């Protein structure tokens, strides 16, 4: 599924990402746009051998288990083929685990370079 901007914000806010670890809601929406284009099924295979899955591009070497990725830690205790749902529950829940503090969104390079310090609230404006 491909989410709309306000559809994703509303979903994410219900799931408690609004201000999670002092990260305002626009941060997460901004990160999803660049990472997955709001596409719950985006998958991108990395030259490092891992693959990134879902609306939040969760990694197969560290956070989820795809079965084809050597050195698999699967710290979110969830198969990657579960992070591709139309419900974002599994993806939000793994994101909550990944970001353990106020530097945690730096887990997404796209957020780091594109969204950090900009007017992220722009992303929820009108919702």
């Amino acid at each position, epitope marked *: 599924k491909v989410f709309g*901007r*306000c*559809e994703l914000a509303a979903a994410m806010k219900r799931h408690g990402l609004d201000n999670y670890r002092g990260y305002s809601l626009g941060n997460w929406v901004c990160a999803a746009k660049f990472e997955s*284009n709001f*596409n719950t099924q985006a998958t991108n295979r990395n030259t490092d051998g891992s693959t990134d899955y879902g609306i939040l591009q969760i990694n197969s070497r560290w956070w989820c288990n795809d079965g084809r990725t050597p050195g698999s830690r699967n710290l979110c205790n969830i198969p990657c083929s579960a992070l591709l749902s139309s419900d974002i529950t599994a993806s939000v829940n793994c994101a909550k685990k990944i970001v353990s503090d106020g530097n945690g969104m730096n887990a997404w390079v796209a957020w780091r370079n594109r969204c950090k310090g900009t007017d992220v609230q*722009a992303w929820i*404006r*009108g*919702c």
Partner: T-cell receptor
Amino acid sequence: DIQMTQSPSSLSASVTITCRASQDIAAALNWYQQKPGKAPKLLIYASSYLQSGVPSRFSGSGSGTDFTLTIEDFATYYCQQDGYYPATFGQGTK
Amino acid sequence: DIQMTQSPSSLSASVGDRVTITCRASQDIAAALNWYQQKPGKAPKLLIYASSYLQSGVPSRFSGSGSGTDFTLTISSLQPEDFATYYCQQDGYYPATFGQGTKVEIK
């Protein structure tokens, strides 16, 4: 798709446009101005947030499903909702 | 803002021809680039989302590619109903910005 119906479709006028969404879009409604064979230019974001450079005679209003743009400026005007996939435009007012 | 440069400005070709339109963003916008089709008398309509995702009902002769700064829309078999102006639009940074458009005509 969320259908954006503008009215009226055309207007003659010498030196108020409506847009209606089929579904509740809250305030996620943008206004665009297009001159002939030119690209659309964004005038208003999120119902009423004017873009920098756009004069104050252009104001915007509304929430939910019924919205208004308020008026060199002979052009087509388009509403566009960008809160729900796929982003859609109304058919325009000339 | 981000400045989109689109080319060519117009083109004309024959039924069945392959045609390609390019869009260059003034900085890296990843895949946050859409293509709109505006038929005469009509509003712009989303044809391709995020560089390559075809919208439903759009025929498979249309496609798009690119990620970063340079993007392309290809019509693999031009048809008379494609008579339109095509716009790229980056929607990754506020405010959303359009290319200048490409009028496509069919002999």
